Design a protein around this nucleic acid. Structure first.
Ligand SMILES: O=C1C(c2[nH]c3ccccc3c2O)=Nc2ccccc21
Lengths: 295, 327
DNA sequence: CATCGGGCATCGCGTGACAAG
DNA sequence: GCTTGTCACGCGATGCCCGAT
């Protein structure tokens, strides 16, 4: 219709919406300041809001409020370790509700001293040499009994040391460390078939993703482990005999039925057919190929 | 003057007083319009009212001055370690809070996002999904959010907790989502310098690597000594490709030339990377001596296309999975 | 104990200048 | 050279206040 009239009407309603939103925000303010909601016009509401904000008062939140929101969102504890030696430079008090460890067991300690030995090598990989992030999974010791380990997902980044704005006094323990880079990270707790490849000992070295649908484990939860570790004790030597026999009979297929402990710690009957892959030049066994099927 | 002008001047005076008190740098405050002044003052009051209920240190057997400064920055350190941003959303889908790092990941300013509807940041096709997360307590999902640097798919890991001290009308507190948003992850090494990153490897007759050039070290991630101490290259090859590579190894044994073959190699990161390669036999006194394989890295798209158009059919051709490698 | 007119303050509306994008 | 939004302004309809009935 008339382009000038429609422009005018759109503009008038835009200004009307603006006025309405201003009024709504002023009502919110009246709800948010002390003596108001306990009735006042716009000017007194604004003056009381000014006074209340002067009371309350650059970041929108304090450091403590930010930390509170992050930990309320997804738990975790902060640690700052040095890359050359794994030396724990800082640990948050959140390590107590996460690992049931006091802050005192991580200070003067090393990240290698706090993880499972089978993981220490991996740790070095993560500590050697957007924003150069790091994302890994490890096993950390806990309170306890005997040694107690829990899987911990770690998310962090490499930071040039020392950090800006933080005073490093002359007589501080950190004064003679001289570490150049540090890892700053958060640690947080927590009928088909699939193919796989193993070495002649039975260690998972390739795992099809369909493992999740077949036995409930992620591929990372199987790789590196021996298949016999997931097999029923009364089927374990049968499975081992099959693995040792398939090596003697290269090319021939061997089938074996056994109980596989799913991740629900439930026994599932599995039929595994296995054969060897021969190196086409030297005829040596490269690995054992298994098809593992639900029964 | 006139009474209308006087009242408007009083209102603007109070609005400027509110603006100067906002906890933002002055360059941010000076660019704020009046509606955003009110919106952010309401934001600050709601935040403070909540923290008054919900909120409130190194162990004294551990306290150094340096550790005390680190403790004073603990929250920022957590935020930087997030690899993402904090989001807190009300039942009314309003952004109760967003950390500053949202600008690092989506390009939105913190002062623009707070106390606006979260759906303005979320893809339409995903908005419904987000709503079902806003209404037994933990949450883990995926949503595509607007990226002004355009969308990025983000993992949201969070929780539903009661947002205290909001003085809704006297209503009880409603559940808000306290989430951390991070980007997604792909498991394949695609070369950025895709063009002519040709690298050559030397191998024994059984394809055990014995030599590698610099571009090979960059692509695969192994040191030369690491590459040669892990058995034959069949330990490096995807299970969906091993039979094809074996056939082409036979072809090379019989004719000295393998021909072009596309397959996946396991990087030191335990990631798969596509390569188009050609393996040639070098001879000593007329007898096979070693192999020289020359490889070009491929994007995942080109690799999938080659696999889709593959010549032979062999078992495990379409299998996908993960691998490891020892010595 | 009200009710009643003054005059100024509040408050919602539409329009015009101006500018970022 | 158009679109969307911010800001001020003019303008009445009520609001509040308070001597004066
Ligand atoms: O290029 C290779 C190849 C190969 N290259 C590699 C480089 C580094 C590590 C392992 C390997 C490896 O296994 N194996 C083939 C079989 C048939 C034709 C071509 C090739």
């Amino acid at each position: 219709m008339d382009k000038e009239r429609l422009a005018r009407e759109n503009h008038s309603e835009i200004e009307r919406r603006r006025r309405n939103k201003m009024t709504a925000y002023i009502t919110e303010l009246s709800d948010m300041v002390p003596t108001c909601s306990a009735k006042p016009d716009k000017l007194t509401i604004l003056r009381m809001a000014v006074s209340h904000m002067k009371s309350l008062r650059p970041s929108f939140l304090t450091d403590q409020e930010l930390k509170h929101l992050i930990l309320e969102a997804a738990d975790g504890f902060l640690f700052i370790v040095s890359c050359e030696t794994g030396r724990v430079v800082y640990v948050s008090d959140s390590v107590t509700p996460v690992l049931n460890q006091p802050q005192s067991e991580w200070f003067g300690s090393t990240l290698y001293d706090q993880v499972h030995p089978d993981d220490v090598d991996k740790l070095r990989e993560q500590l050697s040499t957007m924003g150069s992030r790091r994302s890994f999974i490890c096993r950390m010791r806990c309170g306890s009994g005997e040694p107690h380990f829990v899987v911990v997902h770690c998310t962090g980044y490499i930071k040039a040391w020392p950090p800006a704005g933080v005073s490093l006094p002359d007589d501080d323990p950190e004064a003679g460390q001289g570490s150049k880079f540090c890892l700053v990270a958060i640690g947080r707790l927590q009928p088909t078939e699939f193919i796989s490849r193993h070495n002649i000992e039975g260690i998972f070295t390739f795992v099809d993703h369909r493992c999740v649908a077949t036995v409930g484990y992620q591929p990372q939860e199987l790789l590196g482990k021996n298949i016999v570790e997931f097999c029923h004790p009364e089927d374990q030597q049968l499975l081992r005999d099959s693995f040792q026999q398939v090596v003697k009979l290269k090319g021939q297929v061997l089938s074996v039925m056994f109980r596989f402990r799913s991740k629900n710690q439930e026994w599932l009957w599995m039929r595994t057919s296995s054969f060897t892959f021969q190196n086409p030049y030297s005829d040596e066994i490269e690995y054992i190929i298994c098809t593992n099927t639900n029964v | 003057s006139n009474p209308s002008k006087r009242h408007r001047d009083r209102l603007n005076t109070e609005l400027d007083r509110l603006a100067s008190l906002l906890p933002f740098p002055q360059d941010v405050i000076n660019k704020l319009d009046k509606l955003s002044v009110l919106r952010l003052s309401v934001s600050y009051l709601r935040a403070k009212s909540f923290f008054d209920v919900s909120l409130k240190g190194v162990q004294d057997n551990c306290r150094t001055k340096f550790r005390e400064g680190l403790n004073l920055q603990e929250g920022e350190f957590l935020l930087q370690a997030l690899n993402g941003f904090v989001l807190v959303v009300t039942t009314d889908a309003l952004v109760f809070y967003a950390s500053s790092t949202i600008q690092d990941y989506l390009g939105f300013q913190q002062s623009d996002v707070i106390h606006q509807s979260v759906y303005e940041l979320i893809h339409t096709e995903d908005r419904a999904e987000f709503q079902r997360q806003l209404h037994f307590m933990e949450r883990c999902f995926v949503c595509r959010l607007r990226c002004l640097l355009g969308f990025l798919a983000m993992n949201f890991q969070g929780r539903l907790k009661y947002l205290h001290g909001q003085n809704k009308k006297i209503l009880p507190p409603q559940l808000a989502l306290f989430a951390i948003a991070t980007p997604l992850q792909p498991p394949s090494i695609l070369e950025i310098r895709t063009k002519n990153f040709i690298f050559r490897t030397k191998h024994k007759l059984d394809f055990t690597p014995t030599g590698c050039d610099a571009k090979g070290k960059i692509v695969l991630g192994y040191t030369e000594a690491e590459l040669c101490m892990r058995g034959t290259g069949y330990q490096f090859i995807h299970a969906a490709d091993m039979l094809y590579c074996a056939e082409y190894h036979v072809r090379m044994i019989k004719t000295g030339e393998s021909g072009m073959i596309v397959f996946r190699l396991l990087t030191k990161d335990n990631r798969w990377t596509w390569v188009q390669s050609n393996a040639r036999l070098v001879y000593k006194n007329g007898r096979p001596d070693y192999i020289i394989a020359t490889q070009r890295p491929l994007t995942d798209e080109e690799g999938k296309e080659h696999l889709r158009k593959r010549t032979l059919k062999l078992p495990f051709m379409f299998a996908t999975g993960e691998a490891v490698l020892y010595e």
